[PDB]
Amino acid sequence: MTDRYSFSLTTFSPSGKLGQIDYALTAVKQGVTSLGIKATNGVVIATEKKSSSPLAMSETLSKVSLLTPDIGAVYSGMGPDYRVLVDKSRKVAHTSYKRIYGEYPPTKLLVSEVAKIMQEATQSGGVRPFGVSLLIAGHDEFNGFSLYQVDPSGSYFPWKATAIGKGSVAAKTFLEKRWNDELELEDAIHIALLTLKESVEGEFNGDTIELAIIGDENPDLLGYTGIPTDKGPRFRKLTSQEINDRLEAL
């Protein structure tokens, strides 16, 4: 034994392409569509819960994940790769920030740490790149609301609104038409649902759509009272019922 693959499995080809990163992006292209929209008073991230079999309990599979109380993440591509990245992202938010500064990291810096992890899998010995693209939405005091995309290479970009995966090209076009700098969060949710309906094949309801927001502080979700300055998480996952309520006025 011993891992004797101490050399890079991702290398430059004569044309300057990093093959494994391109192939990782191809895997993301096959992935189910997910998207994010930034409003003035919040951010929305959404995706389709494509269940493999109807016997599967799809609520037990979470595509949208809480990273910190004010930061959430969705993906397109390989689900298992996403799951382990979320575990690592949650841990690095603590080890390299909260245990040092006594507060949760701002969105851009957590994105930076996730990106670094993904970059290292593109250069370190005996590993392949992660086959996912992430959309990370979040809020922090000094930067306000923000939305970032992270790719297999480790590259990240800030967006007003974007989509990744299967029908991203069509979805991005749809988002260019509707997005403006005066959107309220309810308007952004409404647009997210409209955009997502196009790439969805069959059933389109609260049980087949996963959607979360970064919005107002929820003191009812904090779990304790008596510290005025602690006002609760801005990340909230919309219920199946809340999604269906907004699908009527649609």
Partner 1 sequence: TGYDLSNSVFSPDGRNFQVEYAVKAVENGTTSIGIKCNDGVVFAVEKLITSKLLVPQKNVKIQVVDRHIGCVYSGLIPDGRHLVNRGREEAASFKKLYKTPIPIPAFADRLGQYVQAHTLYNSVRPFGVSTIFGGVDKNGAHLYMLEPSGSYWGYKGAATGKGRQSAKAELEKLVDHHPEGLSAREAVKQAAKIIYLAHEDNKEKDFELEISWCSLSETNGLHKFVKGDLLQEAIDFAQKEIN
Partner 2 sequence: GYDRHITIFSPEGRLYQVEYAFKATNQTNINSLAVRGKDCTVVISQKKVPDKLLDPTTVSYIFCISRTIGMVVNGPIPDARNAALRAKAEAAEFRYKYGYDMPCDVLAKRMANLSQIYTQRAYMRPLGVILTFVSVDEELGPSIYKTDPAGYYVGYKATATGPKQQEITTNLENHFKKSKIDHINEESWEKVVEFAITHMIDALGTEFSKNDLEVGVATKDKFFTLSAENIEERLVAIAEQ
Partner 3 sequence: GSRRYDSRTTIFSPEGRLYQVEYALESISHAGTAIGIMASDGIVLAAERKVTSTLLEQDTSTEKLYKLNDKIAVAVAGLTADAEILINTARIHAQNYLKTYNEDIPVEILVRRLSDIKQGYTQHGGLRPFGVSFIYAGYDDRYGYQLYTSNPSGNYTGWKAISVGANTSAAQTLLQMDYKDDMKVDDAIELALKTLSKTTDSSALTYDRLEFATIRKGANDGEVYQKIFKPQEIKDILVKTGIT
Residues that bind partner 3 (CB under 8 A): 4-18, 38, 112, 115-116, 118-119, 122-126, 143, 146-147, 153-155, 157-162, 172, 175-176, 179
Which one among 11, 12, 30, 230 touches partner 2, defined by CB under 8 A? 30
Whose Cβ is closer to partner 2: residue 57's or residue 249's? 57
Interface residue list for partner 1 (CB under 8 A): 1-2, 4
CB of 53 to partner 1, least distance (A): 22
Whose Cβ is closer to partner 3: residue 130's or residue 236's? 130
Q: How far apart are alpha carbons 237 and 212 in whole angstroms?
A: 4
- With contact defined as beta carbons under 8 Å apart, do 26 and 132 qualify? no
Please measure the distance between the N-terminal and C-terminal CA atoms of the chain and give it in whole angstroms. 59
CB of 57 to partner 2, least distance (A): 4
Residue 42: left (phi > 0), alpha (psi -120 to 50), or beta? left
Helix (H, G, I), strand (E, B) or coil at 66: strand
Whose Cβ is closer to partner 2: residue 223's or residue 226's? 223
For the chain, the residue count is 250
What is the DSSP-derived secondary structure letter of residue 95?
I
Which one among 81, 113, 140, 210 touches partner 2, defined by CB under 8 A? 81
What does the block give as tokens for 52?
Answer: 């493999």
* Contact flag: residue 131 with partner 2 (CB under 8 A): yes
Q: How far apart are alpha carbons 228 and 122 in whole angstroms?
A: 45
- With contact defined as beta carbons under 8 Å apart, do 132 and 85 qualify? yes
Binding site for partner 2 (CB under 8 A): 1, 3-5, 9, 20, 23-30, 52-58, 60-61, 79-81, 83-84, 87, 121, 126-131
